[PDB]
Design a protein around this ligand. Sequence first.
Ligand SMILES: Cc1ncc(COP(=O)(O)O)c(CN[C@@](C)(CC(C)C)C(=O)O)c1O
Ligand SMILES: Cc1ncc(COP(=O)(O)O)c(CN[C@@](C)(CC(C)C)C(=O)O)c1O
Ligand SMILES: Cc1ncc(COP(=O)(O)O)c(CN[C@@](C)(CC(C)C)C(=O)O)c1O
Ligand SMILES: Cc1ncc(COP(=O)(O)O)c(CN[C@@](C)(CC(C)C)C(=O)O)c1O
Ligand SMILES: Cc1ncc(COP(=O)(O)O)c(CN[C@@](C)(CC(C)C)C(=O)O)c1O
Ligand SMILES: Cc1ncc(COP(=O)(O)O)c(CN[C@@](C)(CC(C)C)C(=O)O)c1O
Lengths: 304, 304, 304, 304, 304, 304
Amino acid sequence: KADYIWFNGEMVRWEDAKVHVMSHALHYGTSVFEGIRCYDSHKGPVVFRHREHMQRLHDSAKIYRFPVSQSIDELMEACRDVIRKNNLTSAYIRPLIFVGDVGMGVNPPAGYSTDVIIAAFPWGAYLGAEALEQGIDAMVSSWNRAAPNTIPTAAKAGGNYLSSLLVGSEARRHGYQEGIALDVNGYISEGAGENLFEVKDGVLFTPPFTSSALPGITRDAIIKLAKELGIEVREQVLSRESLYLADEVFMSGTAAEITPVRSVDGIQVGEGRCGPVTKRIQQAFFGLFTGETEDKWGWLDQVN
Amino acid sequence: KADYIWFNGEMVRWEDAKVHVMSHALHYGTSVFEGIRCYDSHKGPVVFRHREHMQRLHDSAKIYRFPVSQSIDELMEACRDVIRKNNLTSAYIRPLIFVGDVGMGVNPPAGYSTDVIIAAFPWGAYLGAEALEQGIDAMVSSWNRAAPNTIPTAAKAGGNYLSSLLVGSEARRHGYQEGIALDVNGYISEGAGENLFEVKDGVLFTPPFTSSALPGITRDAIIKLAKELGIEVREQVLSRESLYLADEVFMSGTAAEITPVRSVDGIQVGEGRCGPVTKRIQQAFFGLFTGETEDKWGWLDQVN
Amino acid sequence: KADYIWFNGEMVRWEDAKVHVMSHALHYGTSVFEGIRCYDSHKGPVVFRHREHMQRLHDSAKIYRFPVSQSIDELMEACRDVIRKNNLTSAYIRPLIFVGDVGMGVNPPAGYSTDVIIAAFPWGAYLGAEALEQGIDAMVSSWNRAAPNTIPTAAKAGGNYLSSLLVGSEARRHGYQEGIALDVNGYISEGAGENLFEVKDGVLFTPPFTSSALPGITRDAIIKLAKELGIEVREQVLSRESLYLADEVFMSGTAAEITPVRSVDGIQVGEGRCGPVTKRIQQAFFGLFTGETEDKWGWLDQVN
Amino acid sequence: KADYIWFNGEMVRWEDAKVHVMSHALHYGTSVFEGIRCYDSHKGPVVFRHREHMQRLHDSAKIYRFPVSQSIDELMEACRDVIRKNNLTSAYIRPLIFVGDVGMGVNPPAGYSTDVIIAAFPWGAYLGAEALEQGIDAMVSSWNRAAPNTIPTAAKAGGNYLSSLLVGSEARRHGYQEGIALDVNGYISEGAGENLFEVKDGVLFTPPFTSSALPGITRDAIIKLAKELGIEVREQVLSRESLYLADEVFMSGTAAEITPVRSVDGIQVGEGRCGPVTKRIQQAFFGLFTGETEDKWGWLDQVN
Amino acid sequence: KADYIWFNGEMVRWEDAKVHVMSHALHYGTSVFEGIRCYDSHKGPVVFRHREHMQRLHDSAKIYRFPVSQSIDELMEACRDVIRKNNLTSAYIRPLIFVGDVGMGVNPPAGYSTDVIIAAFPWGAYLGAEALEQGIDAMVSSWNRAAPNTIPTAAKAGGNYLSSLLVGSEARRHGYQEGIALDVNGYISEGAGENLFEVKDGVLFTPPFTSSALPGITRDAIIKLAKELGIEVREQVLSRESLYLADEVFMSGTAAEITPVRSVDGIQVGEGRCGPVTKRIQQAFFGLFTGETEDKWGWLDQVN
Amino acid sequence: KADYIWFNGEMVRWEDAKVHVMSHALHYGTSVFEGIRCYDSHKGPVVFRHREHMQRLHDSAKIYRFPVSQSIDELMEACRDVIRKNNLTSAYIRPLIFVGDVGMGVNPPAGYSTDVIIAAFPWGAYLGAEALEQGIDAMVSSWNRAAPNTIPTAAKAGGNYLSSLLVGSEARRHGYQEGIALDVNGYISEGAGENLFEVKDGVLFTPPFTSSALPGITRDAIIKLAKELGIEVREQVLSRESLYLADEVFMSGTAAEITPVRSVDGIQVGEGRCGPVTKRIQQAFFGLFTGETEDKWGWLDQVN
Ligand SMILES: Cc1ncc(COP(=O)(O)O)c(CN[C@@](C)(CC(C)C)C(=O)O)c1O
Ligand SMILES: Cc1ncc(COP(=O)(O)O)c(CN[C@@](C)(CC(C)C)C(=O)O)c1O
Ligand SMILES: Cc1ncc(COP(=O)(O)O)c(CN[C@@](C)(CC(C)C)C(=O)O)c1O
Ligand SMILES: Cc1ncc(COP(=O)(O)O)c(CN[C@@](C)(CC(C)C)C(=O)O)c1O
Ligand SMILES: Cc1ncc(COP(=O)(O)O)c(CN[C@@](C)(CC(C)C)C(=O)O)c1O
Ligand SMILES: Cc1ncc(COP(=O)(O)O)c(CN[C@@](C)(CC(C)C)C(=O)O)c1O
C-alpha cells in the first residue's frame, strides 16, 4: 500500500488505479512483470540492478511479441519517480506490462498497445523475518516445472505462476516454508519463486536455465560475487539426491534475497543452520549497501 | 459489448465493471473461466450444456483450491439473468472466477475469497464467416503443449493461454487460420483453442486427455452424437503423420463450434472441402436448435 | 508369528528358519515373492486364486532367470501344508524365492540353485481396521515409479520395494495413510503397494501395465467381477487431475483387499465416504467367501 | 570365506553369522552396502579411502532414512578389527546395513533399528586375471539404468542390483566380460557395476551423476590423479556412438579397480590393447601402494 | 534377377536399368518404396492387396512432398505388365520412387520430378525356409526405433532402414534370426523389418502406430482375418516383459509373411514351437490362395 | 558438373559413372558421405582439413560396420587426383561410400564390399551469394531431430537427410532461408544442414553432440579459432528462447561456411546485420587462405 501508482505515464492515486474486468490479461494470463528492490544504503535510496530488470522486462515482452511503447530509460525514470513521489527509502517495485481491454479473442487484434504499471511499496522478507539468519524448511514438490518448449521459462510472465502457486501451496499445506520443484526429467529446477543453490566441497552449484530455471538477476549477482570471493561456481544439472548430500543449500530471488535452507524433506542440511559459504555470500551481498563491498559492476542506481 | 455484467451478485453497467490493477490474477494468471453459448432455437433462447460448463468451472477452481462461494445453481440463474437483462437472444457467455485484490505474494492469504464475473455479448464464428462451410488451413506449430504433471490441462485457467497465444499466433503469422499443437512426446494434442478430430475409414478418432488435450464439452457432445448416428469413435493417441493420411479432419469448441480443416501444412485433406462425416455431424449438432435432432440428453437449458 | 515355516521342502520351527548373512538376496535384492490370502469361508479355509499367485511366482523368477526346482503343484501342496500344520483358518501366506549363500559376485555362478520359503501367519487390514468401511486419505508422492525398460514392474521382486518404501513413507510422514505414485511421464501408476482404480460416470478406469503398474491378481479379479455386474471397465492411461475429478477412487491388493480412498491431497473424493460402485464391488468380492457370489472362475482353492 | 564377521558389535564366527528368513531386507531389498579394499603396501596393510566409503554408507542410509546407531569412527575401528582378527593382509571388505526381523509391512515400524555387518575376505580381480593388462570385451545392454527420480542412483542400496544383474548377465550370456548400460535418454550411464571412462584426444571424459551413474570413490580418485598428471578431465553427457570413436575406454570400481575395455559391441577400441593414458593412470593408482605415487590426499588408512 | 524392369514408363532390360551416381537418393536417402507379393493361386497369379500397397506408396511420397506423376491405376497396370513381361507366376515386386539426378542441395529445386521403378523377381522366405513351420529365435536390440516427431515412421522411405540395418544386424551377429526393437520410451515397437504380434489368453495384441510401428498391410490383414475367426484383437502399448509372458508371439510382413517366434532373448515362448492361434491365422492367410478362405475384401488382384 | 569422377580406383568420365537401380543404398539409405572444400589460396589450391574429413568418413562407416577397403591415405591421394584431373582450383568434393548391388535383404550378405566414389565440382555459397555479408532469416522447425539412441547423429549417413529435408523444406516453404531444429527434449540442436552458434555477452555457445548435433569439422575449427582470438567458448545445452535473447547467432558447415543469422522466427537478432564477433571469426577463417591467419594446426593440405 502506498499513495501513487505510475499508470501509462501518469501518477494516479493508488485507489483510482483501476482497469476493466474484461482486460485480456485477467482472462488469459497475458502479462509480463518484474520484481525490483530499492534499498536504503550508504549513499541514500538505491535501486539494485535497475537497468538489468528493465531490460528483462523488455526481453519477456519480446518473446511474446507484446508491443512496448516505453524505452528502458523511460521506465527507469518512471520507476525513480514513483519511489520519490511516495517518499519511500526502501521498497519493492513492481513493473507490469499487460494486454488490456481488447477483444476476447486469444490473439489480440493488430495495432493494439499494452498498458504499463509501476507500483512501489515496502515489503519484508518473502519467507519470514527470521528466514535470513535461521534457515527455512523446504519440501520437494510432487508438481513439476514447465517442459522446455512449451511455455518459455526465461520469461517472467503472469501465466507462469499457476505452476509456482501449485508448488508453493503444497509445501505450505504440509508445514514447510517453500517448495522445490523438479523439471520433467526428474532433475532439480528451482524453488516455487526463487533459484536454488547448493554447496558441496567448497564449490557452489546451480542448475542451468535448461532445467526450466528462470535466469534470475539475484542468481547472476551471486555467481559474480562468488567469483570475486574466489569460490568455484559450477552451473550443472543436479539430481534430487544431491539436496540430501549437500553441505549447504540456499535460495535466491529479489523478494527472497538470499535465504538459507536448513532442511529438505525433513532431512537436515549439515548442522541445520546457515552455512559458512552462504554466510560469506550474504555478507558480501548486503555489504553492497553498507559500502563494505565495492560496487565494481555498477549495480546500484541512485534514486536521488 | 453489452449493457450489464454480473459482478459478485450485482448487475453492474459494463463501463463500471472495473477492478484494481493490483489484482492477483493480473500478475499471476490466477483465474479460471468458461466459454458458454446461447443459441436462438425453435424453443427460444437456449444455453447449450449450461450445467456442464458451470460444473467444469467449479472443477477448475477445485484443482487450484480457489474458494467459490456461489453454487452451480446460483451461477446458472445469474447466467440466465445476464442474457435477459441485456436482451440477448444469442450470445457468448463468459464466466470468470479470479483472485482479486489480495497481497502480492504468490500464495493468497488464508481466508481470502474470489471475485466472480459473468459477461455475455454476441460473438460470431471464431475462425471466420466462411469457416463452417469451407474449411480452414491449419499449421502444425513448433511450440508444444504443457507436459502432463506441470500445469493441469484439464482445467480451463487463465495462465494456460500463454501457450495458446504462442501456438495460434505462429499459425496466423504464416497465413494459416489456426495452429495445431503436439504434446512433448510428439503426438497430436489439439488446436490452440479447440479439440482435434480425424476421420479415417468412416471412423472418428480423437486424442485422449492424456495427450494434454482439454476435456471439451463440444468434444463430448460430438462423441455422443456420433454414437447416435452409428459412427465408430476411437479415443487414441495420434501421430503427426495421421493428419496427412486422414480422409477428414475438424476442430471443435464452444467458440469454434465445428470447423472443418481443408489442409494441414499446405497438404490438402481429401478433396479440400468439408467432408461427408463432418457434414453429418454438423447437421446433427445444429439440428438441436431447429428441433430436427431430438435433445435426448437435456443439453438445451431454456433462458425464458 | 506362527509355529512352522516351510523351508526347502521341510517344516522347520519358525525360530530355526535362519539363513546366512552373506546370502545374495540380502546384498543385491535378488529375491522374488508373492502375497496370498487364506480366507475362512462357507466351505472352510480357502486360498484365494492360489494357482494364479504361484504361476506369477514362476513368471517373476523366469524374467530374472532364477532357477526354480519346485513345480507349481509342489508349491501349492506345500502352501496348504503350512496352513494346516499351523492350524490357521485365515492367514497371509508369503512365498519367497531367493538367491542364497553363493558368491559375492552380482551374477550367481552357473549351476546355482535358489532357496524357497513359505510362511503363513494371520494379518489384519494393511491400511487400518477401519480402512474398508470409511476410506483413507492418500497423497500423490514426489517420487516416481520405475521407468519401462529398467527394472521390470511386471515382476514382484524384492529390489522393487525400495521405491514402494520411498512413496509410502513420504505419505505417512505427512499424515496420510498411503501414497500414490506417478510414472516418469507424469501419469498415474499406482499406490505404493496396491493398484489404483477410479470411477467416473458409472465407468471404472485403471492404468495399464505400461504405466509401470504391476499386474495385480486382485486388480484382475475386480475387472472380471465388474463385468459380471455389468459395469463398463476401461484400461487407459490416467492423468493426475483425474483423481480430483473422479466420483470414486479405490485401491486393490492382496493385503489391502479393496480400500476406498476418500481424499487425495486434501481434496475430498465425492462425499468423502465409500462410494456406490466401490460398495457393490466390495460386496461382490467378499460375497465369494459367504456363498452369495458364485465362484464361476474357480478362484477358491480348498485347503481341506 | 574367513574366520570372523563383525555382527552388531561382536566378532562372531563366520558359520554363526545367521539372520532370520523373515528379515525385511530379504523381501524388500532394504539394505545399504559398501565395497572397500585393503591392500598390502610399502607401509603394511592399508584400507583405500576408508573414511570416504564409511561416509557414503551413512549417506546411503540417510537417503532412505535407515537409523544407523554406529558413528563413522566406530565403523572404521570395527573394519580394522575384522581385518586383523582374520589375519588378512589384503582383502575385500563388505559393510552391510540392513532392515532385519521387523514386521512384513513395507514401512518398518517407528523405533526400529538396523542390523550392521562387516565381512572381509580375499577377492581377486572382478573382471578376470588377465583383465587388468589385456582389456575386456564389453557390450551395450538392451536394459537401461534407473530413471532420475525413481530409485536414487547416488545410493548404493541392495535393491539397485536387480538392474546390474540384468545388464551384466546379458553381456556374459553373449560372450562378453561386462555390460555397459545407457540411461532412459539413450546416453551412456556406466557399466553394470563400475563407472565408465573414455579418452579422446588426450582428454578423459566421464558421465555426470545425472546420467544415472553412481558417484564412485574410484571414479573420484581417478579424476584427482588425472589432474596431478596434467590430464584434462571433462564430466559431460556422452552419446552411445562415442564408444566407437574413442581412442581409449576403461572401467573403474573398488572390485574392478581400473580395467581397460579393448572392444565394444565387437568394434575394437584403438589398437585393441590397454591404451597410453589408461596405462599412466593405472601406474599412478597402483603406485600409491608402492610409494612411487605420494599419497597427498591421505587415502591410505593404516590397519596396524 | 529377371529380364525387364519398368523404368519411367519403359520396359528396360535389367542390365540397362542404371542411374547416375550423383542421384539425390544415393546421398540423402530420398526415396520411398513398397514391398508387394504375387502369389500363384487357385485363380492364377495374383497380387496380394495391390491397390493398398500402391496407395501407401503415394501416401509415403505425399508426406515428403515428392511429386508423383503416375496415378495409382497407372502404377497397378505397370506392375501387372512387369510380372507378365518376365513370365513370373509368383514373385516379389519392388516399386521405388526416388529423387534422381538433380542438384546436390538437400532440398531439390522447384519443378523437379521423381524417377519411378518397378522390379519383380522371385524371392523366398525372408527369415529362412524353415521359419514358417518351426519358429525363429529373436533378440531385443539395444538400438531403439525413431522417436515420434522426427522421421515419420508411417512412411516407408529409404532413409528409415539405417535403423532396421542396426537392429537386424545386431541380432544376426549374436546368432539370432531377427531383432525386436523398442521405442524411445522402452515399449515394444516391432521387429527390424516386420510387425510384432503377441497372444496371451487367446487374445491377440499388437503395438499401435504411435509405438513407432509402421502401419503394415500384412498387419492390417491379420487383424481383419482374426476378427473373422472370432479372435479378440487388442491394439495397445506393450511392455518388454510381455514377450516373456506371452503364450505366443509372431511377426508379419510382405516378405516375412507370418513367422512364429519360438524364443526371445534365449527365453522359450510356450512350448518352443508354432502356437495354436498362430497356426489358425497362418492357415487362414494361406487359404486365400487355395480358395479355402473366401476373399471377402477383394484382396486378390488378378494379373491375368 | 565436371569431366571425371573417381570410381573404385578408376578415373571414369562423369557421364559413365552409373550404378544399378537395385543398389542397396537407393532403397535403404545405406550410404556414408563427406563434404570437403578445396580453396584457391596464397599457396595454390588447398583442401581444408582433408585428413579430418577422410577420418570421419571411416568413422561413419565403422559405426554401421560398412567394409572400407581403402585407407585414409589412399582416399586423400584419390581426392587430390580428382581435383587435378578436372583442372579445378576451387571446388566442393564429395566422397561417398555406399552399399551397391547386393541382395534386397536389409542386411547385406557376409563378405560383401562397398563401392566408393569421389566427385569434385565448383559450388557456390550454400545459403545464397549475399548470405555471408548480410545474414539469413531462419525459422524454428516443427520437426525434431533424431533421438539419442536411434539413428546415430555423429555419423554422416545418407538416411539421416530425410530429417534435414523435412526441416529445411518447411523453412523455405514459408519464406525463410534455413530451418533450425530442436531435439526431442525441446532444446536447440542445429540447422537442417549446419551447426548453430550463439553469442551472448561476448561469449560463444554451441550445443553439445548430445543435443543431436553432428560433430562438424567447421564447428571444431571455429572453436579452435575463437580460442586463439581469446573468445570464451561454452559447449552447453541451449533453450529455444536463447535464440531471441542472443546478441548474435550464426551457422557453420563445409558448404555453408560461416553464415550469420539476422533473424529467427521474424524476431531480429541484435541490429539485423552480421555481428562483431561473427565478423572477427569470418575474417580469421577466410584469412587462412590469404596468409593473414597462420595455419598453426596444419589444416591446409596442398593439392599440388
Ligand atoms: C520462478 C522464479 N524464479 C526465480 C526468481 C528470481 O529471479 P530474480 O528476482 O530476477 O532474481 C523469481 C522471482 N520472483 C519475483 C518476481 C516474485 C516473488 C517471488 C513474489 C521476485 O522475487 O521479485 C521467480 O518467480
Ligand atoms: C485449449 C482448449 N481446448 C478445447 C477447448 C474447447 O472446449 P469446449 O468449449 O469445452 O468444447 C477450448 C475452449 N476455449 C474457449 C473456452 C475459449 C476460446 C478459445 C476463447 C471457447 O472456445 O469458448 C480450449 O481453449
Ligand atoms: C507394487 C504393488 N502393486 C500391486 C500389488 C497388488 O497385487 P496383488 O497382490 O497380486 O493383487 C502389490 C502387492 N503387494 C503385496 C505382495 C505386499 C503388501 C503390499 C505388503 C500384497 O498385497 O500381498 C504391490 O506390491
Ligand atoms: C553400479 C556401480 N557403479 C559404480 C561402482 C563403483 O564405485 P566405487 O567402488 O565407489 O568406485 C559400483 C561399485 N560396486 C561395488 C561396491 C560392488 C560390486 C559391483 C560387487 C564394488 O565394486 O566394490 C557400482 O556397483
Ligand atoms: C519397418 C517395417 N515394418 C513393417 C513392415 C511390414 O509391412 P508390410 O509389408 O506392409 O506388412 C515392413 C516391410 N518390409 C518390406 C517392405 C521389406 C523387407 C523387410 C526387406 C517387406 O516385407 O516387403 C517394414 O520394413
Ligand atoms: C546435419 C549436419 N550438421 C552439420 C554439418 C556441418 O558439418 P561440417 O561440414 O563437418 O562442418 C553438416 C554438413 N553438411 C554437408 C556435408 C552437406 C550440405 C549441407 C549439402 C556440407 O556442408 O558439406 C550436416 O549435414
